[PDB]
From a paper:
Its structure reveals the typical CODH scaffold, but contains an iron‐sulfur‐oxo hybrid‐cluster. Although closely related to true CODHs, CooS‐VCh catalyzes neither CO oxidation, nor CO2 reduction. The active site of CooS‐VCh undergoes a redox‐dependent restructuring between a reduced [4Fe‐3S]‐cluster and an oxidized [4Fe‐2S‐S*‐2O‐2(H2O)]‐cluster.
Potential gas channels around the hybrid‐cluster were calculated for the oxidized and reduced structures of CooS‐V Ch using MOLE. Additionally, we pressurized CooS‐V Ch crystals with Xe to probe hydrophobic channels. When the four molecules with their bound Xe atoms are superimposed, common positions of Xe atoms in the interior of the structure fit well to the calculated channel.
Numbering used by the authors:
A (entry chain A): 1 to 629
B (entry chain B): 2 to 629
The structure:
């Protein structure tokens, strides 16, 4: 049937049950779309932006330009920028709601508290805010300042990019003129440029894409992740259970799924109440348990420990459909991507109830809607707990047969730059010395999603991670590719012996895995804080560091914006499968050949793990040779 | 080319463009027709993630995309993502206008405060502080409107309470479509269109309605009122249109786009004697400034013709033939439409392309002058200088001019104040002429132009003729308004082409049967007319004998006004068909089920007679329900 499924045997076992129930799934839907693939759109030489279209680029038949007059390069780059507007919008949405959450928490209208006060005061100092009074007043000040960072216009200088970016990179950006405004104004200008007969210059549209990436990282991601640190704590390494074997059908299981962790931690807090556990027990279940899915669950497992209520991480987005096939989910609380639009019939067949906690998430089949609100989240949480208890009693218990796979995997989560400092001994210099000694050739930022385009689920990512660590290359993993690596067993101590000589030796001496789970794609900025550190200790530019960035199985634009950032950051950025720009030769030449003389980085292609690893190692060794190491 | 224009001048200049073996929109349309994608034409395509691209095809088994979305959600999501761009353009213009007003209040621009009466009346309607001198009040109004731009979800708006009718506001409350600021709304909509987020076409259509609402009451009304306060409220006056206004012996600077600040600065600087002496020293008779598309339309709404400013050239499909005249020296571009292939044409005909905005970029532009209110005085001068050299070294003596002879008269500058003055200071006379059957109803023709459903401006002009013959008044905005001005439907001569009652009313009031109200950005301005008639009757806007048509729409600045008209509860005609016709449930919601939700509905068709007949049938249905 489906030609490509997954590398995880649990996901395969559950896809087989999905297919046995004759329910549609992504794997089964891939091939019918393969039958009628459009090479125009796949090469990026098609457009749909105006009524004179739809236009295709075909010079051998006489259609050199669109009806407007744009060429293939401008077409591809403009479409890319247009959809990257969406990723910037998602990150800015997350950041704004995080700042609102911190503001409403500092004034006592949330079930949340200010956990990391050290980080709050350090941010207040570095951003030159007023530190007088209570910590909550400083939290309100930081909320307002980061909202202002969101709101910055084209003519107002920002402070986050001055604090969290190295000197030479800021020099490169100011000499390129790609110093961005606030992410709001930046995405506004990008979308306004993508309109018909506005911006049709592929160089200019790529410049605006780099501007949008910088806007996203320094105006949204860093601030939101540091505010989440202040709220729920800075992550420290701890052991965690992943893969779908963590499910138990005898419990009222609630799964939160999205990107923002507020609903999930509110559910954990409300489930710690004895009254709700007594409700779960009086309903006929053992107790009430909460599970974390994709990036929301990743955020939560970065900072929270495994107990009787919180049981771990389910997987990546391609695991959501088979997860419902377990027949063990009572509530799937959804706040952002991914919430696949055909989840209705699947939850109806397996006895699950779908609840959306966001005004962004809507699709056919949802049972309840509880738009997020910091002053309401507590109540929201409770309502979800009252929904599951009802669902469990009326739909799943004694009616749905569970099919929970046996695969449970150990994974070390919660790695942060502070955790790197702590494991090294408070200083980054030992990492410097093991990099200069040749034991660790370099570090790779694997900020990745997952997709069925360039192979089965997580094949490219996991096999490329193995190939990378085999060549003494450390990996900082974020995104759904990080979920893939945690499930595949590469994020625990047993994985030490899957690394090459130097990397395995150093990781055994430090008692850390060769793949450090830094969390989500939102942590890309956080990962930059590592590279910036490596750039500040050496007084060398980021483009000269033996570092690399890879998204071996990207899907939508939350990773394309991180790739555009890494390009503006001046890094070798591998992206697979091919973004739809290959029908534009000039843009391809700019992205893969010209940019190293503009920003410093370039775009790498390919889905072969061995060859991608070889090219990454070759770039790292070039950087080493020019560093004298 | 199988399709060109109904205007003789543009056909002649297309002939010259074809003589020079140069590419143009008319010629580029046909090669695209041989290989049209029916999928994208019907809106059953998607390119949002790497598991794609996907197409909806139930026969071969592709009922859903790899994500799981259906055709309805796919089409509506692509429509919402596209209209994000139009919302962004409107928000960009509004924010630049607010910054321009505030910087003018501090004495950093060549501008001033022309309409202080409107400044203070709007300050009082918004309950602002009237204290101090007009500069302070202007600063306060700018800050308030900027706050409107940044408004989020728990901050109720004040523009929508002041400028919207009662029953429409109650309907928007019970529907839950009361929008935030346009910035937050466009960001929320763009985030909803990401893969595996919002895949319900009903939710996406509700978000499109919210987007249009946040665009009209969060940007358009305020930006046009601010531009009025800066450059005076427009009043009806004579204007020359079509490309016959060009004279090759002068140094011609044409401002083209949407935002008119660069145009006003250019006019002001060109009126200076030193710049006219610079023009004369180059061998030219004098120095003239011309308006093009929507920026031109703003200026011609507010400015009369004189020795310097000459009027409007045409609409967007007239840009390439305009360069073909061989008379342009500088084409200053501030926004859309700026065709991305103007380089070779400007090289052939000796014109210099200048971009006065960081949004406009394409190969061949010779100078970039990103607009800043505190620099617009030095930009204009530079432009003028760039013209002088470009006159001496490129055009004068080498380029053969081919200026067409067609010139038309148009009465421009029709505003709600203009209607109120022409009616004697009250809305009751219009109520009487409508209730008596003289004017069956009014129609807002807010439109672009395109080659999709016919030659340039064919459907627009013919539909306007049929409407005015059916005793239906027309308020025209956008490039359709330019088409009507060039065709000669906005002067008194057009009264002979109106029906009996409409011609009687127009002869009594001395107005044309088509009122040139400005740009698509003036849709909200037109929304103030309907609202007024809704408040005098105490009826909802869905009960009024009004309608809205975009018979040759092109991009999303028109589709967002159509989404507003839908949320406004109006019969909204749009042609050609937007890419949704492959989504049966979405077409059902837009064309059939929306009357029970908002009151309005989408109408389709490019046959002028049938479209006018359906519009008149809707107006007569409303009339019968009103008892008139
Ligand atoms: S913007 Fe240009 S290329 Fe795109 S559909 Fe319109 S005419 Fe065709
Ligand atoms: S968003 Fe969905 S329908 Fe669109 S290309 Fe991706 S998988 Fe296909
Ligand atoms: S699917 Fe329409 S051009 Fe590719
Ligand atoms: Br094809
Ligand atoms: Br401090
Ligand atoms: Br402060
Ligand atoms: Br050409
Ligand atoms: Br086809
Ligand atoms: Br005074
Ligand atoms: Br003036
Ligand atoms: Br003079
Ligand atoms: Br300024
Ligand atoms: Br009025
Ligand atoms: Br009267
Ligand atoms: Br159709
Ligand atoms: S990602
Ligand atoms: Xe299904
Ligand atoms: Xe052909
Ligand atoms: Xe993309
Ligand atoms: Xe919020
Ligand atoms: Xe609370
Ligand atoms: Xe670039
Ligand atoms: Xe917490
Ligand atoms: Xe809130
Ligand atoms: Xe239920
Ligand atoms: Xe670090
Ligand atoms: Xe490390
Ligand atoms: Xe890295
Ligand atoms: Xe471990
Ligand atoms: Xe080590
Ligand atoms: Xe990075
Ligand atoms: Xe990219
Ligand atoms: Xe990336
Ligand atoms: Xe690329
Ligand atoms: Xe559209
Ligand atoms: Xe501005
Ligand atoms: Xe005010
Ligand atoms: Xe504001
Ligand atoms: Xe709707
Ligand atoms: Xe009128
Ligand atoms: Xe008046
Ligand atoms: Xe009326
Ligand atoms: Xe009207
Ligand atoms: Xe109207
Ligand atoms: Xe309107
Ligand atoms: Xe529309
Ligand atoms: Xe419209
Ligand atoms: Xe429609």
């Amino acid at each position: 049937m489906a030609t490509k499924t997954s590398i995880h045997p649990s996901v395969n076992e559950l896809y087989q049950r999905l297919a046995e129930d004759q329910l549609s799934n992504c794997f089964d839907r891939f091939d019918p779309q393969e039958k009628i693939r459009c090479n125009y759109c796949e090469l990026g030489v098609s457009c749909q932006l105006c009524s004179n279209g739809p236009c295709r680029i075909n010079e051998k038949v006489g259609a050199t330009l669109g009806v407007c007059g744009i060429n293939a390069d401008g077409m591809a780059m403009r479409y890319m920028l247009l959809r990257n507007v969406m990723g910037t919008s998602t990150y800015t949405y997350h950041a704004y709601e995080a700042y609102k959450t911190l503001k409403m928490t500092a004034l006592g209208n949330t079930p949340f508290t200010i956990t990391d006060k050290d980080k709050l005061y350090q941010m207040a100092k570095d951003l030159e805010l007023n530190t007088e009074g209570k910590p909550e007043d400083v939290a309100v000040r930081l909320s307002d300042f980061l909202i202002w960072e969101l709101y910055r216009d084209y003519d107002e200088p920002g402070k986050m990019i001055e604090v969290y970016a190295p000197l030479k990179r800021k020099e490169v950006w100011r000499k390129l003129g790609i110093y961005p405004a606030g992410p709001l104004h930046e995405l506004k200008d990008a979308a306004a440029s993508c309109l018909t007969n506005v911006d049709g210059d592929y160089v200019s549209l790529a410049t605006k894409g780099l501007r949008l990436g910088l806007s996203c990282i320094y105006g949204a991601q860093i601030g939101l992740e540091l505010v989440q640190d202040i709220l729920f704590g800075t992550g420290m390494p701890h052991e965690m259970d992943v893969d779908l074997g963590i499910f138990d059908a005898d419990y009222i299981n609630i799964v939160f799924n999205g990107h923002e962790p507020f609903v999930g931690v509110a559910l954990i807090l409300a489930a710690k109440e004895a009254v709700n556990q007594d409700k779960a027990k009086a309903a006929g279940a053992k107790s009430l348990r909460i599970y974390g899915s994709i990036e929301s669950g990743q955020e939560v497992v970065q900072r929270f420990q495994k107990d009787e209520v919180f049981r771990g991480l389910t997987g990546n987005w391609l695991t959501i459909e088979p997860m419902l096939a377990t027949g063990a989910v009572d509530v799937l609380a959804m706040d952002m991507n991914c919430s696949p639009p055909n989840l209705g019939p699947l939850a109806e067949k397996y006895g699950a109830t779908l609840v959306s906690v966001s005004r962004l998430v809507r699709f056919p089949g949802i049972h309840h809607f509880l738009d997020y609100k910091p002053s309401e989240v507590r109540e929201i949480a409770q309502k979800i707990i009252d929904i599951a208890v009802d669902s469990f009693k009326n739909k799943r218990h004694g009616k749905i047969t569970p099919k929970i796979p046996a695969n449970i995997q150990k994974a070390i989560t919660g790695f942060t730059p502070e955790a790197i400092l702590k494991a090294l001994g408070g200083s980054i210099n030992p990492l410097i010395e093991v990099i200069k000694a040749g034991k660790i050739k370099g570090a790779v930022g694997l900020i990745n999603c997952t997709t069925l385009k360039n192979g089965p689920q997580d094949y490219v990512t996991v096999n490329l991670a193995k190939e990378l660590i085999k060549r003494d290359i450390l990996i900082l993993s974020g995104g759904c590719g990080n979920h893939a690596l945690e499930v595949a067993g590469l994020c625990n101590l047993d994985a030490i012996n899957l690394a090459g000589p130097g990397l395995s030796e150093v990781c055994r001496n430090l008692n850390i895995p060769p793949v450090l789970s830094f969390g989500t794609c939102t942590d890309t900025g956080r990962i930059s804080l590592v590279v910036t550190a490596l750039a500040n200790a050496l007084n060398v530019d980021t483009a000269d560091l033996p570092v690399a960035v890879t998204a071996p199985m990207y899907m939508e634009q939350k990773a394309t914006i991180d790739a555009l950032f890494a390009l503006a950051y001046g890094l070798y950025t591998h992206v697979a499968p091919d973004p739809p720009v290959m029908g534009a030769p000039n843009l391809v030449k700019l992205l893969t050949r010209d940019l190293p003389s503009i920003t410093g980085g370039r775009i790498a292609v390919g889905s072969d793990p061995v060859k991608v690893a070889d090219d990454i190692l070759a770039h790292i060794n070039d950087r080493r040779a020019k560093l004298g190491i």
